RNA sequence: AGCCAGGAUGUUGGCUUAGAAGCAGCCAUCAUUUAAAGAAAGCGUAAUAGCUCACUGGUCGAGUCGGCCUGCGCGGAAGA
């Protein structure tokens, strides 16, 4: 390894993909298979790519005196185990689901996702982002306005009103 | 995916698919049919061209036969028909034998698009790079 | 040093009786249990047991650490109790209990009958479990290692007294 | 940065000599210029650490007499027999 | 055993004790690698 | 130091190879997947192996590692 330079290096760096990243995730990995990587890594190959990192720093004492880059809020994201996911390009859209959907297949506990950065707070996972470049959930949004949502009460009660 | 439960890879070519005196009771002997190794394989074998090499999976339940998906050959058979020698090794690092470049290769490295470690479709060149090198090849790139 | 140096909180519940040299813990389950000591000295106070050497003994830490530990496994000892379990292995092995007394089948022209000691209880839950819970940590370890011993398990097929922290090597015999 | 401190030595002789890498001292000299030789005692275990950085025998050493700094060149160097300790160390006014 | 006049942990599991007045190898993985009077 | 994890993919590498898919064998030891993962440590395979090691993350929370110069002891050590 090395010493209070490799240190702050893997900080810098590491925090660096937190300010000039996208998004940002924090999972504890109890039980880390290879497979693990061989997931992320996988959903790179033809969705993603080298444009995301995870390292397990919860070095802590590194990956968080190493957020001068405006980190706050995260002392309390500094609990037991983590595994960094931070973005550098693409959408912050489609990195937070991949977990989603792993831990929620057992993939290793996922810190409840304890929230991260971007919006800059505390757990709830929401799905602000992943409905991008899917517009056509704007298409079914307008809901025919003036036709779908009247094809389903003004016209309803001839299907349930003849009672 | 999952982790373990049945599978094997014992072959020489697809020339000649289901041998006998090569692997015979060989080939299979856990839940595999000698004689039933010639018609799941040659479906698609005797699809594409016979040849090079073609290990598989051996994803065995208790439900008779079995079932095999199969993928990609190995990259260091390709010098035997698109490269040079019949051999390979041989003589290894006591005398530049073979030379290949980077011309060459490349529609080798192109062909397996759903077996590459490396999204970077460039990095994934790096790899084949050394299957060809395994026996004394210098590379002209 | 370090285990001695550590705490050993007396759980709402243990008696906690220190007369000189000599400490006696009791609570929920297990006939008290009372050892002695030497030159560590044990000081209780609080909610814990402190322990530390005594100056005049190089032995001191040393002997205030196994202190430590002992008096640990004592508290614990009356607390939560003590674990065991062996697993017999071979065709028409077995074991018994018929009272405070096991019998065990081993294979041998006889059974064998081996008498429980003072407060340790035991169990076959199966043909081929024994499973044995008491207070005193360093008894149960006894009568297991006792009770395994009729039988040792043989490093060829495997049959024999087992605990089940098992490892078994066993091995392949002399080629023809 | 080699520094070393010593005594002006008040006995000389492999009597005395013994005495002192026995008492974990030992015997050195300091010689040239027009300044007449020096008698002196420097610690072994200190030294035993300056000599084993190369740096001993290229860089000028400083001498501290009583406080006075002297400062000379590593001339040359006695080594046990069998053993990695000093036996002696000449000096040069250098 | 092994009573050889010099023990020397031959293994990694080799651990090498004194129980009494002699040292002996204690190995977990190996039993040959047992030994006494040392 | 324990204890919780992980240890792949090109690559079953080709090879004097009956069969060799890391370890009686040859020579090679290069490049990726990433926090780490060696064509490389061990058991030992009909061949897959299954299960475990260097190396990295987690827990814990103050020391810990091995040489050097020296003092005193242990084994080595059986006889009428
Ligand atoms: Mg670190
Ligand atoms: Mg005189
Ligand atoms: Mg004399
Ligand atoms: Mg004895
Ligand atoms: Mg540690
Ligand atoms: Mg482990
Ligand atoms: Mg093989
Ligand atoms: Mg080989
Ligand atoms: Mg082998
Ligand atoms: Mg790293
Ligand atoms: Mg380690
Ligand atoms: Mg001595």
């Avoid at chain 1, 831990?103 to 992943?130: H, Y």
């Amino acid at each position: 390894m090395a010493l209070n330079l490799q240190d702050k290096q893997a900080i810098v760096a590491e925090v660096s993909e937190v300010a000039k990243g996208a998004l940002s995730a924090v999972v504890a990995d109890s039980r880390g298979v290879t497979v693990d990587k061989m997931t992320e890594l996988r959903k790179a190959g033809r969705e993603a790519g080298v444009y995301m990192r995870v390292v397990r720093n919860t070095l802590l004492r590194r990956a968080v005196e190493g957020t001068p880059f405006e980190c706050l809020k995260d002392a309390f994201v500094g609990p037991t185990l983590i595994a960094y996911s931070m973005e550098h390009p693409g959408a912050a859209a489609r990195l937070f689901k991949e977990f989603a959907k792993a831990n929620a297949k057992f993939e290793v506990k996922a810190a409840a996702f304890e929230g991260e950065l971007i919006p800059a707070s505390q757990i709830d996972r929401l799905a602000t982002l992943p409905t991008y470049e899917e517009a056509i959930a704007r298409l079914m949004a307008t809901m025919k306005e003036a036709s779908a949502g009247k094809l389903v009460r003004t016209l309803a009660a001839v299907r349930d009103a003849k009672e | 995916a999952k982790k373990v439960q049945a599978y094997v890879k014992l072959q020489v070519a697809a020339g000649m698919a289901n041998p006998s005196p090569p692997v015979g009771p060989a080939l299979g002997q856990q839940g595999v049919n000698i004689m039933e190794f010639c018609k799941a394989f040659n479906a698609k074998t005797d699809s594409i061209e016979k040849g090079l090499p073609i290990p598989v999976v051996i994803t065995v339940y208790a439900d008779r036969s079995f079932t095999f998906v199969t993928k990609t050959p190995p990259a260091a058979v390709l010098l035997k028909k698109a490269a040079g020698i019949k051999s390979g090794s041989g003589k290894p690092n006591k005398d530049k034998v073979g030379k290949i470049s980077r011309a060459q290769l490349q529609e080798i490295a192109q062909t397996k698009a759903a077996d590459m470690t490396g999204a970077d479709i460039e990095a994934m060149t790096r790899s084949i790079e050394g299957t060809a090198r395994s026996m004394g090849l210098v590379v002209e790139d | 040093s370090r285990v001695a140096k550590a705490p050993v909180v007396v759980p709402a519940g243990v008696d906690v009786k220190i007369n000189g040299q000599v400490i006696t813990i009791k609570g929920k389950n297990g006939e008290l249990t009372r050892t002695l000591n030497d030159a560590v000295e044990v000081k209780h106070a609080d909610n814990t047991l402190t322990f530390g050497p005594r100056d005049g003994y190089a032995d001191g830490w040393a002997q205030a650490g196994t202190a430590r530990a002992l008096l640990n496994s004592m508290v614990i000892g009356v607390t939560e109790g003590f674990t065991k379990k062996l697993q017999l292995v071979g065709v028409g092995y077995r074991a018994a209990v018929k009272g405070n007394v096991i019998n065990l089948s081993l294979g041998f022209s006889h059974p064998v009958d081996h008498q429980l000691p003072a407060g340790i209880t035991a169990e076959c839950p199966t043909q081929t479990e024994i499973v044995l819970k008491g207070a005193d940590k360093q008894v149960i370890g006894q009568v297991a290692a006792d009770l395994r011993a009729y039988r040792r398990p043989e490093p060829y097929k495997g049959k024999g007294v087992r605990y089940a922290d098992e490892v078994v090597r066993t091995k392949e015999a002399k080629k023809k | 940065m080699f520094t070393i401190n010593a005594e002006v030595r008040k006995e000389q002789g492999k009597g005395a000599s013994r005495r002192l890498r026995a008492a974990n001292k030992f015997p050195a000299i300091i010689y040239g210029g027009k300044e007449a030789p020096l008698a002196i005692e420097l610690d072994h275990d200190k030294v035993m650490n300056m000599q084993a950085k190369a740096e001993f025998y290229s860089e000028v050493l400083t001498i501290v007499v009583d406080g006075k700094e002297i400062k000379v060149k590593a001339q040359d160097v006695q080594r046990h027999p069998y053993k990695p300790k000093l036996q002696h160390i000449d000096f040069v006014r250098a | 055993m092994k009573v050889r006049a010099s023990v020397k942990k031959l293994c990694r599991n080799c651990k090498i004790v004194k129980r009494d007045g002699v040292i002996r190898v204690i190995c977990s993985a190996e039993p040959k690698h047992k030994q006494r009077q040392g």
